[PDB]
Every structure is written in structure tokens, then in C-alpha cells.
Design an enzyme around this catalytic site. Structure first.
Site, PDB file in Angstrom:
ATOM      1  N   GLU A 181      51.380  42.777  47.923  1.00 24.84           N
ATOM      2  CA  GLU A 181      49.359  41.964  47.787  1.00 24.84           C
ATOM      3  C   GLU A 181      50.310  40.764  50.034  1.00 24.84           C
ATOM      4  O   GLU A 181      48.803  40.599  50.339  1.00 24.84           O
ATOM      5  CB  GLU A 181      50.010  40.666  46.993  1.00 24.84           C
ATOM      6  CG  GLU A 181      50.142  41.079  45.340  1.00 24.84           C
ATOM      7  CD  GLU A 181      49.004  41.143  45.439  1.00 24.84           C
ATOM      8  OE1 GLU A 181      47.915  41.343  46.074  1.00 24.84           O
ATOM      9  OE2 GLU A 181      48.595  41.680  43.931  1.00 24.84           O
ATOM     10  N   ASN A 217      37.625  37.383  48.989  1.00 24.34           N
ATOM     11  CA  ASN A 217      37.254  37.944  48.490  1.00 24.34           C
ATOM     12  C   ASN A 217      35.605  38.110  48.648  1.00 24.34           C
ATOM     13  O   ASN A 217      34.891  37.101  49.391  1.00 24.34           O
ATOM     14  CB  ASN A 217      37.645  37.613  46.988  1.00 24.34           C
ATOM     15  CG  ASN A 217      39.081  38.011  46.631  1.00 24.34           C
ATOM     16  OD1 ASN A 217      39.669  36.544  46.089  1.00 24.34           O
ATOM     17  ND2 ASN A 217      39.904  39.263  46.980  1.00 24.34           N
ATOM     18  N   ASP A 255      32.932  37.953  46.346  1.00 28.73           N
ATOM     19  CA  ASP A 255      32.982  36.573  45.181  1.00 28.73           C
ATOM     20  C   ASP A 255      33.103  34.744  46.176  1.00 28.73           C
ATOM     21  O   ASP A 255      32.473  33.953  45.770  1.00 28.73           O
ATOM     22  CB  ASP A 255      33.447  36.271  44.382  1.00 28.73           C
ATOM     23  CG  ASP A 255      34.664  35.542  44.147  1.00 28.73           C
ATOM     24  OD1 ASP A 255      35.262  35.565  45.385  1.00 28.73           O
ATOM     25  OD2 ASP A 255      35.189  35.566  42.778  1.00 28.73           O
ATOM     26  N   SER A 286      35.545  33.941  47.030  1.00 30.30           N
ATOM     27  CA  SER A 286      37.267  33.080  46.614  1.00 30.30           C
ATOM     28  C   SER A 286      38.142  33.771  47.718  1.00 30.30           C
ATOM     29  O   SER A 286      37.941  34.610  48.546  1.00 30.30           O
ATOM     30  CB  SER A 286      37.763  33.211  45.209  1.00 30.30           C
ATOM     31  OG  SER A 286      37.598  34.813  44.966  1.00 30.30           O
ATOM     32  N   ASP A 326      42.470  34.020  48.693  1.00 29.89           N
ATOM     33  CA  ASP A 326      43.811  34.488  48.317  1.00 29.89           C
ATOM     34  C   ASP A 326      44.558  34.010  49.354  1.00 29.89           C
ATOM     35  O   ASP A 326      44.032  34.678  50.103  1.00 29.89           O
ATOM     36  CB  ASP A 326      44.554  35.951  47.603  1.00 29.89           C
ATOM     37  CG  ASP A 326      42.665  36.325  46.993  1.00 29.89           C
ATOM     38  OD1 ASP A 326      42.559  36.383  45.767  1.00 29.89           O
ATOM     39  OD2 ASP A 326      42.971  37.621  46.722  1.00 29.89           O
ATOM     40  N   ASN A 372      44.743  33.450  44.384  1.00 32.16           N
ATOM     41  CA  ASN A 372      42.983  33.690  43.734  1.00 32.16           C
ATOM     42  C   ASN A 372      42.200  31.508  43.540  1.00 32.16           C
ATOM     43  O   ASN A 372      43.062  31.777  42.305  1.00 32.16           O
ATOM     44  CB  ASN A 372      42.117  34.807  43.571  1.00 32.16           C
ATOM     45  CG  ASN A 372      41.446  34.402  43.156  1.00 32.16           C
ATOM     46  OD1 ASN A 372      40.150  33.513  43.889  1.00 32.16           O
ATOM     47  ND2 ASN A 372      40.517  35.782  42.612  1.00 32.16           N
ATOM     48  N   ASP A 377      48.876  34.475  31.360  1.00 32.55           N
ATOM     49  CA  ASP A 377      47.732  34.140  30.542  1.00 32.55           C
ATOM     50  C   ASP A 377      46.784  35.479  29.884  1.00 32.55           C
ATOM     51  O   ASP A 377      45.778  35.192  29.362  1.00 32.55           O
ATOM     52  CB  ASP A 377      46.811  33.885  32.906  1.00 32.55           C
ATOM     53  CG  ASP A 377      45.299  33.073  32.042  1.00 32.55           C
ATOM     54  OD1 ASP A 377      44.803  32.684  31.554  1.00 32.55           O
ATOM     55  OD2 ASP A 377      44.074  33.961  31.665  1.00 32.55           O
TER      56      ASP A 377
END
Ligand SMILES: [Cl-]
Ligand SMILES: [Cl-]
Ligand SMILES: [Cl-]
Ligand SMILES: [Cl-]
Ligand SMILES: [Cl-]
Ligand SMILES: [Cl-]
Ligand SMILES: [Cl-]
Ligand SMILES: [Cl-]
Ligand code: NA
Length: 129
Positions: free
Chosen positions: A35, A46, A48, A50, A52, A59, A101
Site C-alpha cells: 500500500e 482515486n 472517484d 476519494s 487513500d 480511503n 466490516d
């Protein structure tokens, strides 16, 4: 901060991430390697909109607030900047939520693609822990 491999393993263990939700420490070190290359200041944007953040590239779509991700949540209740600190506490505490999650460490696509099913113990081999 750019952690050493065993340095990060030790910090993750002190913060209770070793075997958290059944994921051995090497899984977490492997995820952080791919990562962020162990760099707490890593960020990546990202498609979209967003972003990280940090050693585990958490995110802003769901997990932290950066003020620039429309429609997003802040389920870890932190500014995304807290995920860039030399102190990994915020990243670890938020990762614990993420991995709980429902999809385990598959939440980290890079873990699924590069760590899952591999000899992840190699990432902690030789470390005094
Ligand atoms: Cl640095
Ligand atoms: Cl390494
Ligand atoms: Cl391991
Ligand atoms: Cl936002
Ligand atoms: Cl929220
Ligand atoms: Cl905030
Ligand atoms: Cl730390
Ligand atoms: Cl990947
Ligand atoms: Na957010």
C-alpha cells in the site's frame, strides 16, 4: 516517516494488530508494504475523487474526513491527516474497524492481489517481536 520492516511489525504488534480478526502480523506488514512501502505520508487519489492515506492507504470515501470527498463518510471519526502521522495509532485503530466490516482484509485490494495466499510470515521473519 518511512518505517523499517521489523520496526513496523513491532509497532503494529504493540497496537494489537497481530492476529486481529485472525490476520497474522505478516498479513498486516505485507499489506503496508504494497500500500505505502511503509511510508506514513503516502497519499493517492482515486478515480472517484476519494483519497487513500497513510501506511494502509485508508480511503476517505468511508473512513476519514478530508473535506473533499462529496457524499463520503468518516466512520473512523478522524481527519484523514491523522493517518499520515509518524505515530501509527490512528491508522491501526481505523484498520481494526475496516477489517471488521465484513470482508476481512479483502477490503485492501492490494492485500487480496499481492499478500493473500502467500507466505506472509516472510514479512516478519528475523524480527525481534
Ligand atoms: Cl521520510
Ligand atoms: Cl521490505
Ligand atoms: Cl505472519
Ligand atoms: Cl468530504
Ligand atoms: Cl460518518
Ligand atoms: Cl475532520
Ligand atoms: Cl507508532
Ligand atoms: Cl493490487
Ligand atoms: Na470522508
Amino acid at each position: 516517516k518511512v518505517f523499517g520492516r521489523c520496526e513496523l511489525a513491532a509497532a503494529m504488534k504493540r497496537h494489537g494488530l497481530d492476529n486481529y480478526r485472525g490476520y497474522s502480523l505478516g498479513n498486516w506488514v505485507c499489506a503496508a508494504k504494497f500500500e505505502s512501502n511503509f511510508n506514513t505520508q503516502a497519499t493517492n487519489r482515486n478515480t472517484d475523487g476519494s483519497t487513500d492515506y497513510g501506511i494502509l492507504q485508508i480511503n476517505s470515501r468511508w473512513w476519514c474526513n478530508d473535506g473533499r470527498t462529496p457524499g463520503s463518510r468518516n466512520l473512523c471519526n478522524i481527519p484523514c491527516s491523522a493517518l499520515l502521522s509518524s505515530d501509527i495509532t490512528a491508522s491501526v485503530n481505523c484498520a481494526k474497524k475496516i477489517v471488521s466490516d465484513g470482508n476481512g482484509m479483502n477490503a485492501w485490494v492490494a492485500w487480496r492481489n499481492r499478500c493473500k495466499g502467500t507466505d506472509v510470515q516472510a514479512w516478519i521473519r528475523g524480527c525481534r517481536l
